[PDB]
Write a protein that binds this ligand. Structure first.
Ligand code: HEM
Ligand SMILES: Nc1n[nH]c(-c2ccc(O)cc2O)c1-c1ccc(O)cc1
Ligand SMILES: Nc1n[nH]c(-c2ccc(O)cc2O)c1-c1ccc(O)cc1
Length: 394
């Protein structure tokens, strides 16, 4: 005898476990146990994944209900699991979206300049360099301080909350509350700071004083700042880092994108498709009894949407493990989710990767890992898959 299959299978972000393809072929929805001891339904085919994500009766918000089967412990207040809902209800969705587009004036040039500066600093210091801690993460942090309108010097201290805030823990985390409360107090100060007049925080600070938003809570405005900084920085930093590993281990691609950088957007889209950055399925709570494949999911049950299950499905993406720049369905992957909760930062995330990769390939065309790949240390019990260091030479 053995215990029910447990998730996640592996914290390694450089290879997909063979088990995923066996699950998808034999039982594309099947029961698993999460780190809390709860049972869940693990969905691993493209067809089923999309079904769940496009059916709002599979609820994000209700994942936070008391007594529900849980993937992990909350690290935020329960109302924040409905953060986009709350933003929408307060009439802030359009404003938020306008603030976090990469099309803002000078923002792409800021990204380019910062990428180049970080890489020049590595080149000056000499190999080996750490491309996570000294490239991808500072580039993500700088980008988000600019997007928010907050001082660049405040980036590092906000960033130091993230190794805890994005944990995927069986139990509540005392440090996550200490850092949340501190970060909310910082964003509440920024809304009262007259020097802050640009970016998402400058726009929220104006809307706060506009009569049409007078009944929006000060808690919501501060929470938008904290959440969009942390979600953006973790997601862009982790995605770039793991895409950089995928590129380093494909020199033929690395060399084609060096030689024809116009193919960088198509390459980033494929890097998005194969990316293993999300460590867990996306959770949803069934709010009705709903047939999914061969399983009738019951009201109150937890469903986990495995992005890599969808994104490696050979029925949808033939030769799924290959990076193919000419696919007919290139953006139809689920790297940014699907449906009501589709990533609001998708365009920003794509541009951060594109510019980071362009900059790196121009400055370090001979980039390679400086350790054998098996020596990378994968962060455990986290909402992302990430190596703790990414040592490279060039
Ligand atoms: C490559 C970069 C990124 C990836 C791969 C990514 C991926 C995702 C995915 C998969 C979801 C859907 C979660 C779900 O349905 O349960 C999502 C949601 C979210 N993303 Fe991103 N994201 C990235 C960048 C960003 C950026 C740059 C921001 C903000 C500056 C951001 C903010 C958020 C927020 C706030 C949500 C929650 C939306 C909701 O609840 O409706 N993301 N992201
Ligand atoms: N899923 C999450 N885990 N941790 C967070 C989070 C974000 C910022 C932060 O400072 C603390 C966090 O716990 C989130 C979060 C939750 C909702 C949201 O719209 C964006 C991010
Ligand atoms: N308001 C709630 N408090 N706790 C729950 C809950 C959720 C899932 C479960 O399996 C058991 C519960 O009591 C709910 C809830 C919320 C929505 C729903 O469709 C079913 C139950």
């Amino acid at each position: 005898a053995t215990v029910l299959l447990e998730v996640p299978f592996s914290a390694r972000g450089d290879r997909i476990p063979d088990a995923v393809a066996e699950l998808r072929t034999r039982e594309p929805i099947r029961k698993v146990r999460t780190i809390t001891g709860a049972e869940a339904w693990l969905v691993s085919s493209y067809a089923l994944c999309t079904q769940v994500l496009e059916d709002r009766r599979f609820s994000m918000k209700e994942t936070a209900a008391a007594g529900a089967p849980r993937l992990n412990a909350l690290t935020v207040p329960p109302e924040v699991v409905n953060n986009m809902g709350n933003i929408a209800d307060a009439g802030l969705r359009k404003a938020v979206m306008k603030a976090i587009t990469p099309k803002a004036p000078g923002l792409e040039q800021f990204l380019r300049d910062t990428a180049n500066s970080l890489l020049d600093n590595l080149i000056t210091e000499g190999a080996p360099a750490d491309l996570r801690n000294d490239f991808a993460d500072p580039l993500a942090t700088a980008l988000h301080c600019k997007v928010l309108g907050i001082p660049q010097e405040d980036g590092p201290k906000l960033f130091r909350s993230l190794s805890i805030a994005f944990m995927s823990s069986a139990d509540p985390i005392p440090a996550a509350k200490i850092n949340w409360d501190r970060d909310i107090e910082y964003m509440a100060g920024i809304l009262e700071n007259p020097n802050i007049t640009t970016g998402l925080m400058g726009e929220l600070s104006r809307l706060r004083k506009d009569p049409a938003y007078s009944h929006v809570s000060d808690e919501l405005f501060a929470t938008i700042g904290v959440t969009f900084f942390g979600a953006g920085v973790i997601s862009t930093g982790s995605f770039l880092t793991t895409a950089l590993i995928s590129l380093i281990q494909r020199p033929q691609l690395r060399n084609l994108l060096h030689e024809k950088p116009e193919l960088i957007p198509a390459g980033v889209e494929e890097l998005l498709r194969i990316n293993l950055s999300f460590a867990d399925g996306l959770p949803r709570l069934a709010t009705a009894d709903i047939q999914v494949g061969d399983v009738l999911v019951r009201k109150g049950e937890l469903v986990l949407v495995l992005l890599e299950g969808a994104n490696f499905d050979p029925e949808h993406f033939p030769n799924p493990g290959s990076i193919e720049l000419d696919r007919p369905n290139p953006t139809s992957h689920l790297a940014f989710g699907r449906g009501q909760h589709f990533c609001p930062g998708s365009a920003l995330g794509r541009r951060h990767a594109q510019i980071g990769i362009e900059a790196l390939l121009k400055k370090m065309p001979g980039v390679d890992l400086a350790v054998p790949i098996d020596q990378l240390v994968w962060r455990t019990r986290f909402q992302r898959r990430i190596p703790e260091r990414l040592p490279v030479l060039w």
